[PDB]
Design a protein around this ligand. Structure first.
Ligand code: HEM
Length: 395
């Protein structure tokens, strides 16, 4: 077997991870790593676990060596369902679709900031700022305070993505304290004088005589911040990278905008920014050939599932036309990403504008192998230098 530690962020920063996944799928689909940690590597195993939440629970927390927090993603039904219905008020199909104009304007502003230069870092300048600006605007964050939230988000993702030192633990707690303070200020303000922002909508949400408490509002908005920021970033950067590495794909999209929805799905399949979520076993079970024990956690390897040849023909081919494309980047089942529509909307609006406004975009070096973030949870490109013919801003 490959000698790997699936809780080590260095594994996921390796471009040989998919080679390891390939071995797992072919030889021990429910794999145990060098330390005995169990992981579902095939699409079939991931789906089968997702469909059995009573056996494969979220209530032990979704990271391998960390306890549950009081938030939707660390809950099982029926409690989870109530929490999700409450928060869903902020993510109805209509409410998300109505953000189109505002998100488009953010995209044009971001491209305006670099279009005259002829070069930018696609990650720093386009992929990273968009998701935080979208969430920031929902949360009432002033534009000049976005970078503060970007840092807190990175701190928290880092905490979820490793076993932190004492120092980094304190940094995480301090970031949470700051987020908590900010959010409680917003909650107090909105409970008194409602606007149309996210905290306002969540405060007014009601399900079967139940409402979100201040504690729950802090936790659920935090989950939204962390869940929707760096994930979206990595699909935007890594997905655009594949368009640039395969010019035929870039060319297809540019000459046919109707192919955009399929392109976004392939970007999602390929990038799988969430590399795993954990499930805790509620009983001993024989699962796709591997004996699992009550109380242990098993990873769902979403990237591995997304490259499973049982489901995706020639999975190492990036193909924007792929149909079907039933990837698991957003998971499956009762915890299926609540923000999936918003993420898709951001990715579509920015990609449409990149294709249009930076039509000859290319990677600084076509032979570059760019670094991935060492993290065991959410990961993608650190940097992506790109060049293009300059143009005047739209303003
Ligand atoms: C490309 C971007 C994103 C990816 C790849 C992603 C991925 C995921 C995954 C894998 C899960 C857990 C699914 C499972 O275990 O089966 C999840 C859950 C969740 N996501 Fe996302 N996500 C993205 C963007 C967002 C955004 C923009 C939001 C904004 C709110 C968001 C909010 C949430 C929430 C609240 C949950 C918990 C759902 C539940 O437990 O019922 N995510 N996401």
């Amino acid at each position: 077997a490959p000698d790997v530690d699936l809780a080590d962020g260095n594994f996921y920063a390796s471009r040989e991870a998919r080679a390891a996944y390939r071995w797992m799928r072919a030889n021990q689909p429910v794999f145990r790593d060098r330390n005995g940690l169990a992981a579902a590597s095939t699409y079939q195993a991931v789906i089968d676990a997702e469909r059995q939440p009573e056996l494969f629970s979220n209530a032990g927390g979704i990271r391998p060596d960390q306890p549950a927090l009081p938030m939707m993603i660390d809950m099982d039904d029926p409690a989870h369902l109530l929490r999700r219905k409450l928060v869903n008020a902020g993510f109805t199909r209509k409410r998300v679709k109505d953000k189109e104009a505002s998100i488009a304007a953010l995209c044009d502003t971001l491209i305006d900031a670099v279009c005259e230069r002829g070069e930018c870092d696609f990650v720093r300048d386009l992929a990273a700022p968009l998701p935080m600006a979208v969430i920031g605007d929902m949360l009432g964050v002033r534009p000049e305070q976005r970078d503060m939230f970007l840092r807190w988000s990175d701190d928290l993702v880092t905490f979820l993505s490793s076993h932190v030192s004492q120092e980094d633990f304190q940094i995480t707690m301090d970031a949470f304290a700051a987020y908590n303070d900010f959010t409680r200020a917003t909650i107090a303000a909105r409970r008194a004088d409602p606007t149309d922002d996210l905290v306002s909508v969540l405060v007014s949400s009601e399900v079967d005589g139940e409402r979100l408490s201040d504690d729950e509002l802090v936790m659920e908005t935090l989950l939204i911040l962390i869940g929707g920021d760096e994930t979206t970033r990595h699909t935007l950067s890594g997905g655009t990278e594949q368009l640039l590495r395969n010019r035929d794909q870039w060319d297809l999209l540019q000459r046919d905008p109707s192919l955009l929805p399929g392109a976004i799905e392939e970007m999602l399949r390929w990038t799988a920014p969430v590399k795993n979520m954990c499930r805790v076993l509620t009983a001993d079970t024989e699962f796709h050939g591997t004996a699992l024990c009550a109380g242990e956690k098993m990873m769902l390897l979403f990237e591995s599932a997304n490259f499973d040849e049982a489901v995706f023909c020639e999975p190492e081919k990036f193909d924007v036309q792929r149909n079907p494309n039933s990837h698991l980047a957003f998971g499956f089942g009762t915890h299926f990403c609540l923000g999936n529509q918003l993420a898709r909307l951001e990715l579509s609006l920015m990609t449409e504008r990149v294709l249009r406004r930076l039509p000859d975009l290319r990677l600084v070096a076509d032979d570059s192998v760019l670094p991935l973030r060492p993290a065991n949870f959410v990961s993608g490109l650190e940097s992506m230098p790109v060049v293009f013919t300059p143009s005047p801003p739209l303003g």
